[PDB]
Amino acid sequence: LTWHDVLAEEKQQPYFLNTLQTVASERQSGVTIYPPQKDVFNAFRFTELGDVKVVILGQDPYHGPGQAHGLAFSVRPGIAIPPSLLNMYKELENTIPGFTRPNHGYLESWARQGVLLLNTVLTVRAGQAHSHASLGWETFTDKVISLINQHREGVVFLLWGSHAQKKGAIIDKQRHHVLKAPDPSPLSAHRGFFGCNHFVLANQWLEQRGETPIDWMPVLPAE
Amino acid sequence: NLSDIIEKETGKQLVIQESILMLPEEVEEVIGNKPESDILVHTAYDESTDENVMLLTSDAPEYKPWALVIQDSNGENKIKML
């Protein structure tokens, strides 16, 4: 069960080719888009289908230079921790034993442990937030979540904010564990995200199923 | 641009780190006023005061300024309609 195996038929779809072609055309026309084309599918690269244990949905990649690199919420090394990720940290410190706030926002180690850090829209025009929505990525990421709901069993979904929560409609809630809560954005963290305990609840669900829990402390690769 | 609108109301020069999309119902509670459409919460951090300056606008490509929210080290907002 790999991505190339289940997504092969979807790569052929007219709407999908339309999207990649629009993005590519814009890049060719001098429109800077993030992340670099080489990093657009990193989430699937780092986390294969049989390895998906936790699914955390984001919206679109960061629109600033050097921030995004294919993973949701994660920023490259040397980039300031974005406010939301910071609040994700504040909740982890409060709940996960042994967790101390990191000094970066690079989450490759999460992806390596089975956390599919997926943004619903995989690209953005530099400087303009949400510039690539209603362009095809949503349909694609809808199928991706549909494929996970289908071929897998017991995956714990972490849906933050009402936008993300809408994608729970295609997830059988008896087949998969779905945890809802408001977005970790400073504006909304104080109405349900803080104290949601999503991280510890996620690991408890993973241990009560034979799977090895996630070590939420992110690590930095050398040099 | 959006960064100037932040400097226009607060006098502080900050870079927008993230822009989180939010539905009318979500921002209705916190702000205490339901917006006409989807809102983008443009968030910038100001370590100088440990505050979070959030510039809320309508969705792309209009980005019509809706309000300015400042949150302090106590998670308390200071809302200002634009």
Swiss-Prot record, chain A:
Name the InterPro entries for this protein. Answer: UDG_fam1 (IPR002043), Ura-DNA_Glyclase_AS (IPR018085), Uracil-DNA_glycosylase-like (IPR005122), Uracil-DNA_glycosylase-like_sf (IPR036895)
Biological process terms in GO annotation? base-excision repair, AP site formation via deaminated base removal
Q: Does the keyword Transmembrane apply?
A: no
Q: Where is the active site?
A: 60
A GO molecular function term, named singly, is:
uracil DNA N-glycosylase activity
SMART domains the record matches? UDG (SM00986), UreE_C (SM00987)
User: Which residue positions does the secretion signal occupy?
Assistant: none
CDD domains noted in UniProt: UDG-F1-like
Where located?
A: Cytoplasm
- What EC number is given for this enzyme? 3.2.2.27
Superkingdom to which the source organism belongs: Bacteria
Sorted UniProt keywords: Cytoplasm, DNA damage, DNA repair, Hydrolase
Catalytic activities: Hydrolyzes single-stranded DNA or mismatched double-stranded DNA and polynucleotides, releasing free uracil
GO cellular component terms, semicolon-separated: cytoplasm
Task: Please give the PROSITE patterns that the UniProt record associates with this protein.
Answer: U_DNA_GLYCOSYLASE (PS00130)
User: Per its database record, what is this protein's job?
Assistant: Excises uracil residues from the DNA which can arise as a result of misincorporation of dUMP residues by DNA polymerase or due to deamination of cytosine.
Quaternary form? Monomer.
Q: Which family does it belong to?
A: Belongs to the uracil-DNA glycosylase (UDG) superfamily. UNG family.
What is this protein identified as? Uracil-DNA glycosylase
- Where does this protein come from, organism-wise? Escherichia coli (strain K12)
UniProtKB/Swiss-Prot annotation, chain B:
Function text: This protein binds specifically and reversibly to the host uracil-DNA glycosylase, preventing removal of uracil residues from PBS2 DNA by the host uracil-excision repair system.
Name of the featured protein: Uracil-DNA glycosylase inhibitor
Q: Which organism is it from?
A: Bacillus phage PBS2
